[PDB]
Subunit: 115 residues, 4 copies
């Protein structure tokens, strides 16, 4: 897994389960082309989005559907989604972990980049 | 001032100064029409982006140029920027404060919505 | 006002109001001598905790009663409180702002230190 | 592992390695008695602090030595440490994951509590 997404719920103190995640890659014509998508598991993790071969150099956008997550719990949140945009693999292949913590009116995201 | 942005620097424990902030409104064609912009003051605040007349219900995007900020400090950042996307006033005009805390590999944002 | 505390609520997207805040100074016996205290205002701010004369170099603890806050909202919290421990002015009087964002199972804090 | 601690570095986008962690438990005479201690591994994780049998009901304090971590990287941080105080196992045995994200002038902590 060159790209992994982990999402936590700050209100329930739990993994954020069944959270839709969409990954895009900036095309040559500056458009966002769909790259991969999935949903977080029971552990709040999303594995197997892509492969080392497919995950080339580029600018990527990870869009976490936080709104749908909070709605399903009967909460009307502030954000439409949580976005993470980053240039990947510019100095060679790396392993990326995108961690997100969710509150109805707040979110934080951090990146763990290893070799 | 129905919309305010405040940005902090978690590395130097200071306001994030001279940070470019762009605000967009979602058009009917579902693209982002530029709406307002500016740069954070010495207190890391950005006021007078819009007015009560102009700030109608809709979906707004607040884009914070975090990458330029870190580049100017000589610090390698992860994110291209920080986006904050929300539906405004979906029950009528309140005051919006978008607060952001910046680190090279992490950002957190929260909304303070008041009467 | 050399020391200010501001508390936000990530669940309701509002200032955290009427939150008890206690400040301690580390004594020579290395216990915490009470120093100042108060409750956050309607803007979630707490001013006039101390003065420039009283606020000398040393190790200070800012204890935020987050548990009482969540109990009053009818929300089950994880933390007993939020402590912020720091060495003050270790190169001479600057102004300190302790910002805290509260969620039932999470809290974040940052310091804004200025001239 | 009924109690696990995971620590990340928001400046380097990496696990926080070799971070000292001290766990205390509130005694009957209201004193903090030493419970367990350890250091985070290469993955920024601390496992095997305690056992299901030893981890009884009580109020616990997890103290993360963030100051020493930043010093070793040539940084003079704001906080002396990052503290997490919580009542554990009040409605029966639970599994606790304490996650912490570190910046020189900021930290956030969240709890993941499962069965
Ligand atoms: C930024 C903040 C507030 C603090 C750290 C954090 C987070 C959300 C999710 C995760 C965080 O760190 C631990 C991380 C994690 C958990 C289990 C695991 O096996 C690997 C991991 O990288 C998940 O939010
Ligand atoms: C750390 C995090 C997640 C993000 C920023 C933040 C916060 C909690 C409280 C405050 C934050 O930044 C803005 C700050 C603030 C607000 C109004 C003001 O007039 C001055 C300020 O310094 C208060 O949580
Ligand atoms: Ca390259
Ligand atoms: Ca009990």
């Amino acid at each position: 897994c060159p790209l992994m997404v982990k999402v936590l719920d700050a209100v329930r103190g739990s993994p954020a389960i069944n959270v839709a995640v969409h990954v895009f890659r900036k095309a040559a014509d500056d458009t966002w082309e769909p790259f991969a998508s999935g949903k977080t598991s029971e552990s709040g993790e999303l594995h197997g989005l892509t492969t080392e071969e497919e995950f080339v150099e580029g600018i990527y956008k990870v869009e976490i559907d936080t709104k749908s997550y909070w709605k399903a719990l009967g909460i009307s949140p502030f954000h439409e989604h949580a976005e993470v945009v980053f240039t990947a693999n510019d100095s060679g292949p790396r392993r990326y972990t995108i961690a997100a913590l969710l509150s109805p009116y707040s979110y934080s995201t951090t990146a763990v980049v290893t070799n």
